């Protein structure tokens, strides 16, 4: 069950996201996961976030769905809190080092890479999403990402800064 | 959570499945669910299994994946006894009538479905799987779907047809 | 000429429909006649459309475009009468067994599965057609199936439920 | 019916070949009529054709395929005798200038296009079929061409050559 | 460095365009070359060019981007004055005869061709360009063409016809 | 020309690369630089490179192609030397902080880094690559990654750890 094995890692490039969403490419974990990365980076900056939250929300970004592997990637609105209490014991079996990683987190690297998470996905669906359905899940996503932010711990700056550039970001995607 | 609209259950077409595996392309649950009445038909016609087994097995066939409208399509490795039982209620929910046909289901009817429902994916996986990994889950599957077979409850004229079937198809596949 | 296996019939997941539009990816048979199964199941359904005629229709749905495995799939305009004429008789030859079908329809199954037929291909480029050809077939389909609707056998009261969800049903695809 | 327009006229490239046949991808009209308007150019001339039949293959080569613009792309099995005499009075009516240039042709240049033609589409599908019965189409392509080139008009010398070259090419391809 | 072989020439189908941009597929340069010269065929004559001058536009149109089979195809913004110098040297190199075809050219088949490869590339996006970028770098393309257009030195009633059938045209695509 | 913007920065994955080769999908770069880093960071860690190597490598491995979202990716048997120079500058205005990453990089890292990023290309083909070209640009890529490696200065132990790993990982790809 535990993922040891480079070869095994880098099919990463072999797992689908979007499982029940009409796309125009099955997207892959590995671009979504630089993706991520880059908003972190680029985002947390922006913020001007301790460069040690940067860091370490950057750090799990790499990494965060590599047990995706052996599970695939489940639909968000699937992910009940049973269902995750299930994966999360599954997916500490699958990749220890991630579960480690996720546990050590500070809650302001945590916020700072669920909404990179989600916004990578709306910008993702802005091009590559295919009708009603993709359309309503884009901006269901926006919605849970607003939500999620507003209800952090992040400085109300923070929130600003994150959100201008969100929008930013998307009017040019 | 439960699906009640034609305009969900025609999505179907947009869940997509081998999440974890390199393909061709994204095969849908529509053509997996056509693919998998087609062989209950054919082979259990093939097997001379009674008509009211067949038809069972090939009403079966074009609905059993619908909660994957919700849920996506999870691999078959991923899919142990814990979370099948959790998957179960979840999925009951969703198509409680794919739930009842479940549950009337005679087993010879229930053997040929999933046997034809493993073949189908051996048979895709022939033409459109890619790579090393992809390689060996076909194998895989194969040596499973043999498995289940031989220590099911259909006659061995009945299996032993089946695989005369299976083998002649994915020689010419 | 004459299809007679099973690895033949398979091949439905091979042909692909929309051959002269511009799609965002290759439908196939398989998925559509699924598809269109569905729409038999449900509207006849909807439509309070007898037990008998609905079974017919939905029998008729599953097999009705296997000739394709050998002719492939024409464009709707392409097909005159005169090419029509030609073509029966080769498809007669191709799948016996789905023109014994044909021949046996009733009209309201067939006025039934003729509206799903050309339902389903308006719904499928309202997702996945691209460009101002495949937007004007869309449309073209459309009024074509409002069209043989309106001069149908079927009933003013199934005609309406058909096209009450129909409408439903594409605004939310 | 008639194709008189620009705007049809570049939908050559929505035409999709290899309707019956599993491949990589769906190619086109427009890449297929280049590469043979390419074959024609290099390999009449390796043959040392005269100039005026290479230039005719050339010129029909890019335009042949023009009528599936409207009629769609169908099966060379598909295409009995009968059918074809039905279909070359539509493509006439599709493209007068086409049929006026096919009616014009040099035996030797339509030997040299056909055998292009074909050759194309066996060196498409060694690099892009996929399956048991892509393969089978390729290898049957490959006779049929051979079997029409022996029978043909064009000298041994000349017959040679084209073979020289398809089989360099295809080790290549 | 120089191609030579006709399985080189084959991979046009194998260049893919649009390196930079996102597209629904990869168009490659074989279809791209083919609708070109479709172009300067058609709007050649509909300008009332001389026919000799529509002649080496196609020509031209058919063989322009071969040397992209080693080169790869590169993005317009980057093609700076600098590096077209040094492309120029490299690409006479890898194809002479495509190089003498150009330094042969009459300026008014030059600019009906460039204006073509231009109204090609913006055609294509029309149909297959996905997100803001795209969109942006399908009106950049429609603006450079016109800016060229009008400063070439083709008679202005041509300049018009030109823009006239580019204008239908797009509007039908 | 410089790129500063995070909408610029997620164009990372609608830049292809393979521009000359074909493939059963158009990778683009993030997905092939996420892969990049998941060499360094695990094959620097087997061969026992020192912590701070492996870092920097892993650095420049998620932002080294970075430029090309402006550049476009360009074959390597294209980038002569010569091609080299000048893009050095084009790239270094457009991305400055790779570049300086770049000058800054141990020349073990470096090692490490073009191992990886030469190897992630050879096993991408192994499972993507079609036909007879993408073979033997699969094959020359594994010579030229060994002939590197092999006279670099990494020490001949973590040259062995690395072609270990190679092999044992491209066995299961
Ligand atoms: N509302 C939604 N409906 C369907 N799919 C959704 C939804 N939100 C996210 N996703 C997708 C994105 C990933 O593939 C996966 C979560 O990482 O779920
Ligand atoms: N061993 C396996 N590894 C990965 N994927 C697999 C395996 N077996 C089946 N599948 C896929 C097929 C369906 O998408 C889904 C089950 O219906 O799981
Ligand atoms: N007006 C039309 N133009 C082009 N294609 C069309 C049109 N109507 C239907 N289709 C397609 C759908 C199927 O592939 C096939 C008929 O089943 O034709
Ligand atoms: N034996 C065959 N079976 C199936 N498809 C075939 C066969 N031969 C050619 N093709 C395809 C190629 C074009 O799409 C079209 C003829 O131009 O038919
Ligand atoms: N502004 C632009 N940005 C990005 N890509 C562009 C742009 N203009 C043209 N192209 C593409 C089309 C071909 O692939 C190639 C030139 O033949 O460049
Ligand atoms: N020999 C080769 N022929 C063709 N393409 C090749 C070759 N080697 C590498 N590539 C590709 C991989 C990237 O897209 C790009 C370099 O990063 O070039
Ligand atoms: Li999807
Ligand atoms: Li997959
Ligand atoms: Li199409
Ligand atoms: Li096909
Ligand atoms: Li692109
Ligand atoms: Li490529
Ligand atoms: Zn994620
Ligand atoms: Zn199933
Ligand atoms: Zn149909
Ligand atoms: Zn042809
Ligand atoms: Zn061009
Ligand atoms: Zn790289």
């Known amino acids: ?78 992910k009940t809190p049973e269902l995750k209490e299930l994966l999360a014991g599954i997916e500490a079996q699958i990749v220890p080092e991630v579960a480690e990683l ?15 998470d989600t916004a990578e996905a709306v910008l993702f669906l802005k091009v590559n999403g295919l009708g009603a359905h993709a359309y309503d899940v884009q901006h269901l996503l926006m919605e849970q990402m607003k939500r999620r932010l507003m209800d952090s711990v992040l400085d109300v700056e923070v929130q600003d800064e994150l959100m201008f550039q969100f929008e930013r970001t998307i009017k040019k995607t």
């Not at 969403?21 to 908003?39: D, F, G, K, S």
């Open 102 to 116: 996720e546990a050590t987190m500070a809650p302001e690297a945590r916020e700072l890479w669920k909404f990179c």
């Open 1 to 78: 069950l535990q993922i040891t094995e480079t070869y095994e890692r880098l099919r990463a490039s072999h797992i689908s996201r979007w499982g029940i969403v009409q796309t125009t490419y099955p997207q892959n974990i590995a671009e979504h996961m630089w993706r991520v990365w880059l908003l972190c980076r680029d985002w947390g900056a922006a913020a001007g976030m301790p460069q040690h939250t940067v860091r370490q929300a950057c750090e799990f970004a790499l990494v965060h769905d590599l047990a995706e592997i052996r599970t695939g990637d489940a639909p968000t609105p699937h």
